[PDB]
Amino acid sequence: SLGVTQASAQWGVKASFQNYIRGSIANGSWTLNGVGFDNQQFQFSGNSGAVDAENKTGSINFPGSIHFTGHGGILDMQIANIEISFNGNSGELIADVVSSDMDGNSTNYGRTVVGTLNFSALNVSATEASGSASVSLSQSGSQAFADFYTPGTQLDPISFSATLG
Ligand code: HEM
């Protein structure tokens, strides 16, 4: 097995969700704690995780949170501590999620699979790993989005790169 030296990931959650949050219906915004933003993608930076190159499995862990708000605080969605887990060319996007429904009632979903990953590219070597995957929304993710997206909806794709040591 190989440890992650430096990893980075790029994921916008969903472009149409960003535009909704910042648009004239939600009249909302987001705040970031330990996460950046560029190219309409949240920017994650991590130095932990491990990759079993022999078996092409791994987990790439990131700190940081995104906090979406809208509708005078009725919409309140937190996504934190994302993790890209892979086994072969499939995997899971895991995060800690707390979100509210349209009544403003919050649910702590805990640490949950937000989507299943299907990698279009996944490369692993002695010194690096990188990949890009489509993200298919999970049951818990659909509930966290207040049922506005159905399970299986395609979110933004996620990409990552990591040095390994
Ligand atoms: C008073 C509360 C709310 C109202 C009136 C409301 C209303 C709406 C409306 C009218 C749309 C369509 C927007 C468009 O197509 O441009 C929409 C989309 C959406 N809403 Fe809200 N909503 C509320 C709360 C919430 C909450 C609590 C969530 C939880 C995350 C949420 C998640 C979404 C999502 C995911 C979409 C789809 C955005 C997209 O097009 O990608 N909404 N909502």
DSSP string, the chain: -EEEEEEEEEE-S-HHHHHHHHSTTT--EEEEES-EEETTEEEEEE-EEEEETTTTEEEEE---EEEEEEGGGTEEEEEEEEEEEEETTEEEEEEEEEEE-TT--EEEEEEEEEEEEEEEEEEE-SSEEEEEEEEEE-HHHHHHTTTSS-TT-B---EEEEEEE-
Strand partners, 54: none
Q: Which of 79, 78, 76 is nearest to 104 (CA)?
A: 76
Structure tokens at 136: 């298919």
Alpha-carbon distances, residue 58 vs 85, 89, 90, 119 (angstroms) = 6, 11, 11, 13
User: How many domains does the chain contain in total?
Assistant: 1
Binding residues: 16, 20, 148-149
The parent domain of residue 69 ranges over 1-165
The CA-based dihedral angle spanning residues 38, 145, 78, 70, taken in that order and rounded to the nearest 10 degrees: 80
| Non-local CB neighbours of 140 within 8 Å, separated by 6+ positions | 97, 109, 112, 113, 114
Dihedral pair phi/psi, residue 84, rounded to 5°: -100, 115
Alpha-carbon distances, residue 101 vs 22, 73, 107, 108, 148 (angstroms) = 18, 11, 8, 12, 10
Radius of gyration of the chain (CA): 16
> How far, in Å, from the CA of 112 to the mean position of ligand 1?
22
Which resolution in angstroms does this entry have?
Answer: 1.3
Q: Whose CA is nearest to atom 36 of ligand 1?
A: 148
User: CA-to-CA distance for 70 and 126, rounded, in angstroms?
Assistant: 45
**From which experimental method does this structure derive?**
X-ray
User: CA-to-CA distance for 34 and 150, rounded, in angstroms?
Assistant: 29
